Amino acid sequence: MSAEVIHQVEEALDTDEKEMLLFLCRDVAIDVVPPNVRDLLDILRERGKLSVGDLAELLYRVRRFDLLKRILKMDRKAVETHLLRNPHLVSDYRVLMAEIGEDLDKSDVSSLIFLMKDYMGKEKSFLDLVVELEKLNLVAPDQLDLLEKCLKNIHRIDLKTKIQKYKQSV
Amino acid sequence: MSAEVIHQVEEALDTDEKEMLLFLCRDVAIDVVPPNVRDLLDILRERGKLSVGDLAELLYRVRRFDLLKRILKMDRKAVETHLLRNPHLVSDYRVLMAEIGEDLDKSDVSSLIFLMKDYMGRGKISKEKSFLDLVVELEKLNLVAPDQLDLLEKCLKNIHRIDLKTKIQKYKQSV
Amino acid sequence: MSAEVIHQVEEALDTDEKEMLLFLCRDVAIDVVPPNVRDLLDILRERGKLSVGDLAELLYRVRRFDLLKRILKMDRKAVETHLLRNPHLVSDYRVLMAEIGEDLDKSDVSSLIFLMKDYMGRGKISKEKSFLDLVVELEKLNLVAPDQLDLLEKCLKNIHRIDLKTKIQKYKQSV
Amino acid sequence: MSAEVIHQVEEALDTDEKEMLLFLCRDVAIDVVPPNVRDLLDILRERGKLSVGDLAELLYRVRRFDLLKRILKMDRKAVETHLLRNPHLVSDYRVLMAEIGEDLDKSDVSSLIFLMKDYMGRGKISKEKSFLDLVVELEKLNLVAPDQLDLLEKCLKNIHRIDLKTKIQKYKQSV
Amino acid sequence: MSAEVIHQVEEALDTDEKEMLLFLCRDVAIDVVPPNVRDLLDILRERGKLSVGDLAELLYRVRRFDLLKRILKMDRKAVETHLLRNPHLVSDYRVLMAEIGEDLDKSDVSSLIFLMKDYMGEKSFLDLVVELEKLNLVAPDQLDLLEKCLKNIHRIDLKTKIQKYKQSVQ
Amino acid sequence: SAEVIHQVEEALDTDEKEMLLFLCRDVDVVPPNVRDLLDILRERGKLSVGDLAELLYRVRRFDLLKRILKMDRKAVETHLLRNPHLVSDYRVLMAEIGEDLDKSDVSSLIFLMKDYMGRGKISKEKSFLDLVVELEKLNLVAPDQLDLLEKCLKNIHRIDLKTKIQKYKQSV
Amino acid sequence: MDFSRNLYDIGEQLDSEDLASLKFLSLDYIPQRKQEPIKDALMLFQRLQEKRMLEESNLSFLKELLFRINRLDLLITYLNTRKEEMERELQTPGRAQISAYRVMLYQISEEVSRSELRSFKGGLQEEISKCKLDDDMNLLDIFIEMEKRVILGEGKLDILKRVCAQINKSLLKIINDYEEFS
Amino acid sequence: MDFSRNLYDIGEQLDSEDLASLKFLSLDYIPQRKQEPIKDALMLFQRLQEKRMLEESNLSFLKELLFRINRLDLLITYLNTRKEEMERELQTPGRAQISAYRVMLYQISEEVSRSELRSFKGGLQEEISKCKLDDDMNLLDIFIEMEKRVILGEGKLDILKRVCAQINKSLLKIINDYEEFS
Amino acid sequence: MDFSRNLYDIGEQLDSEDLASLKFLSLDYIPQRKQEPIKDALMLFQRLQEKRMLEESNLSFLKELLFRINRLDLLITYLNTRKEEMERELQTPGRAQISAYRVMLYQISEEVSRSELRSFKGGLQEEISKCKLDDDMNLLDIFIEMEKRVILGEGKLDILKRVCAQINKSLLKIINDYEEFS
């Protein structure tokens, strides 16, 4: 909405949640890469795809409920009902990727990138790794064999169960 | 008041109480996040919410009376009387959380972060975190509030600790 | 009214708004192209189509309230009422083009000129030109008209700026 | 006084202070707008409003005491005494604006331009500006005045900066 | 082919991708050095050296298959067949230099710069390569200096790659 | 004596160039570019083989002295002992102090000196030489009075440089 | 480029602790500002070359530095110098480019364990804030800080003797030997 | 990705002590600068791959390394090789990429208990400072330090024999057998 | 929060010896590298939850692990399951997830006293070095070392019987019963 809300949102968030927000909003701004969260929010406002409901949903995806209670003056029940009724902006693929990347520690990602180093050529995070894999057209909402196979290979079966659940849902 | 006293206070503080000081002043300056102690003190000075009395109160909260005597040239009696007869800069909820966090060792914070692992994630709790970090994380998800402490009390009950429950109930009755 | 006041008003404007003032008076002075601001103002005044209210409206269209109050001794309310009670000297299409040009930054006008270099001359627009110059060039080819804005709407959509397209559609539906 | 001293002053001032000097001298030289410092100094010398005391006051207002001691061979005490017993060439409003602009950095001017980008043209302030340029733009719209300062105080309060607001209130109470 | 296609290509690329593309098209920039990638694309288009296949080759040589599929509607097999059947634009020597530069680390390139500072008078590998080419020290036919320098820094895999390339030309 | 200047200016460093400009501020407005400063110095006739050698010696770049100017340490030392035509003792002392402070110390200095200087005037991420030239412009540190600089330097718990100041002042 | 290759080969055999020891031992020729960004031996060698202390025809300083940190294998393997030659050369007056004060300080620093380090930190808390007495600060950092606060130097040694009198006794013997060297 | 998966599976079974032994056994091909920032076997495998000593078409070095530290289950499971084949291959001259001196040192290091380790530390106080007498140091670090101070070279073994003479005779037997080997 | 509370309550009761026994009994699912940092029951429970073998719906593995360490009170209190039902479930083929080889090894470890442990250590000094035969080692460590050196396994049991024949015959009975069952 107004610039006050955007400024407060930019001031509240820390760096990791900023990176997660950038990854989540990467899909809608697929053509222009925003360097800062301020530029991303300005681009969304200019394109007309940013509203009160969309901003509330985006803040809910990052799991920042205090901002919803404080800035937007909304509770989680209302935004949940709006999500259940109105179509959502970010796809289920992006939120699934965020869920998977949230539960991976700093040691498993090193093993995963060591396993993936055959297909490519440096403190990486799982979000950067999945972005890099997407750039090479290897992991997509249609093709998920690679990630499931490597997640099984490193003895992590709960994430494989999550991926199977996502595939069953769609 | 001046920058010299702020610099002396910052350089006279160890890394143990710096996290305490950052957490204690979250309610005073909630719109922004300060990276270190000097930036927080500068922010309070610019906002006009920092004076000799406010600095004395903050130093009294962190249990560093020697700094009060050496730098501010004040004793605990005058600052205690001023605190009694003037509004507090920091809420009682924050000081209660700090007091509770100072009464837990490393063998208990792991148990607490294991008990509430479902709400949080593995990556968020991978590093060793004090009780203050857990309290901040719970507050971010709107699970703990100054007027809502049931979940924390029940979790402390589940780890076989009673005195902290008595302190929580005492504060609740103090409201 | 007099020559001295017109001279002061003309010299008080900067170089940036001179192009806007030249563009906004194209429809009023259509018989002959104006060489500069002074000659254009003299032609407008001598023909009887320029008066104190017309000059006030012209200064209001460029958002220069300080010159209106200092020189013409008229606030925004007076000129607004005069414009409401009198026929508009400048068309709504011209002021809409001016607003669109104002709302666009240089990084976007570069994209517009690069994208539309194919339809127009290969190196005609190579010189750095604002959006108003591109609009004038398009009007030279009769590709954009007050009743013909679909091409401009498509071009504006091609740079991923939909609010301006909504504004154009709102103006079209209103009139 | 002479032209050699004017040239020496012009060559000894950096780019940053040139903008401050131009902003401070806008009120005095209102008939014409100068693009460079040398032309403005020449106009003031021709008009008779430029003298040793006036130049000393101008250089003191820009905080360049070394040039006063070197070129004009005057120290801070002499210029202060001269200013105390002479009419002020620059109004207190301009020096207050200059001081406020001095007490701001990039992390605040970015917030100001982002917040107030809505009222004025988005492409008007597309290029990176300083606080003085923003004040000039606001003055062109007759929003901030030497007697009206509510809007500036509200904007300063919106960025979580209270000491400058207290300075504004002190200046208001001075009159 | 149209202006918007190269506009999207320019906008979607990254800074490192931009630099690699600028270096990789050095052969066709004989007329003038292009300060910007969009300017280079304009020069290539107006000179008749740019087409669908050429742009596909440039996008394939920088590992951006997502742009190939989404924008130009092509896959890896199609561009591989096009490369096999149609003549190449950029010589394989530039490709080998880019491939070598993609594997060296910051410490390795710093050590290489320190070793080679005797011959010459922060810099990435590509800047070092262009500086060496400026002094007429490294050429597509002679690679003794680079091979010896790579062997001296215990990175023998790139030496093996260079030897394989040298055996390829004969 | 023209092309070697290009090699010298191309073989230097950014912080080295800033220190060179600070040293040459003694001898008009200093050009922002080192090449323009060298050209102006040659135009004025001040530039000379001995003067350039002494200037390069004052910044500890002996490798360029032997590489380009074909001079060793002993010759330039004797020439400087004969007469310091270009630079003075005050600028050398300022450079010596500036070369002995790490990032934390200069950050603390700018934080302390933010009292009576504007935030935009000093900004952030600056060198000690920039603070020195700002204080010179404000006219509170001159070869006659250094009490404020000494007090500020003592306030940051650095007494050896205070000795340095005391020794320099008592040398005359 | 044989010289650069040899210098790189020598630099590949030095770890972080030895690099810190070299940085402490080279305080007289590299100021703090030029020393802070150094994180590898190559930068130190470049800085030494810039002052014309290390070159093809002048390897004395590098030999001395590698000898005083006790890395005697690199000397024979790469620089081709046995221990006897260095021992004979160092004792000759006017041929040592490192003051004996720094060598004595480093020798004292060699003989302190973690418990001794904690005792040393506790003893010298009178004039130093606890912020500068963190666990990251090793004995070399404490000595540098003491030098900065002009409480320890060539002419000032009473504080060091008094502090060392509690932890151990042979350290006083080493200090007395250094005084005998004066 | 079968090869990378196999390497990861092999590296999953190596603990800290075996990792330290592996790092010690490969000092001839990895300098200390690369040795220091190694905390998991994956980095060591990457470093070995970078030198063309471990790949799809060459696995001899990995087999030798896993055999020299007495880990045969990994060899029989994840590499399909038995003890007799490895012994016969190693007996062939020109195939031992690890010098017999390093193997002898490692075998000696396996034959020292805690009390014998303390006795060894006490017996080497002549030429080594007391800072290395910490309980953290094992025998391998002592051997590395001795190699650093050119007292435990391949040609020089008198000091090692003299020190081992006060502990056990089997160590002297091993040293004599190694000497008889070459 | 009830399931995690129950898991924590179960994990609190166990002591260090039970923790070591549980760590040994789960070697087929957790490799050595992940086994090393485990110091408490919570870490082991998290490791098991990672592999999706312990959760609200599936609790067979935890019950079997508790039963195999003779902890019936925990099974009847914090899991609400009786001994007879667990025995019936284990007797069903395919239901048991722990191989009987590990079970019989753990039973043999239980059936050996301190003097018998010392006799076993003395009896196998030829094939195992003295360092791996340290006093702090128990029978489980010896079994792990023998498994590593591929001298004790499913297909090879001659050494185990040969050593155990000199101590007791009940162990031979257990081995024969296992062989008959297999």
UniProtKB/Swiss-Prot annotation, chains B, C, D:
Residues 1-175 are annotated as: Interaction with CASP8. Residues 1-73, 92-170 form the DED domain. It comes from the Eukaryota. It comes from Homo sapiens (Human). This is CASP8 and FADD-like apoptosis regulator subunit p43. Residues 1-175 are annotated as: Interaction with FADD. The chain holds residues 1 to 175 of 480 of the full protein.
From Swiss-Prot, chain E:
Coiled coil: none annotated. Residues 1-170 are annotated as: Interaction with FADD. Residues 1-73, 92-164 form the DED domain. Residues 1-170 are annotated as: Interaction with CASP8. It comes from the Eukaryota. This is CASP8 and FADD-like apoptosis regulator subunit p43. The gene is CFLAR. The chain holds residues 1 to 176 of 480 of the full protein.
From Swiss-Prot, chains G, H, I:
It is found in: Cytoplasm; Nucleus; Cell projection, Lamellipodium. Generation of the p10 and p18 subunits requires association with the death-inducing signaling complex (DISC), whereas additional processing is likely due to the autocatalytic activity of the activated protease. GZMB and CASP10 can be involved in these processing events. (Microbial infection) ADP-riboxanation by C.violaceum CopC blocks CASP8 processing, preventing CASP8 activation and ability to mediate extrinsic apoptosis. Coiled coil: none annotated. Changing residue 73 to A: Abolishes binding to FLASH. Induces NF-kappa-B activation. Isoform 1, isoform 5 and isoform 7 are expressed in a wide variety of tissues. Highest expression in peripheral blood leukocytes, spleen, thymus and liver. Barely detectable in brain, testis and skeletal muscle. Thiol protease that plays a key role in programmed cell death by acting as a molecular switch for apoptosis, necroptosis and pyroptosis, and is required to prevent tissue damage during embryonic development and adulthood. Initiator protease that induces extrinsic apoptosis by mediating cleavage and activation of effector caspases responsible for FAS/CD95-mediated and TNFRSF1A-induced cell death. Cleaves and activates effector caspases CASP3, CASP4, CASP6, CASP7, CASP9 and CASP10. Binding to the adapter molecule FADD recruits it to either receptor FAS/TNFRSF6 or TNFRSF1A. The catalytic domain is sufficient for recruitment to lamellipodia but catalytic activity is not necessary. Belongs to the peptidase C14A family. This is Caspase-8. It comes from Homo sapiens (Human). The chain holds residues 1 to 182 of 479 of the full protein.
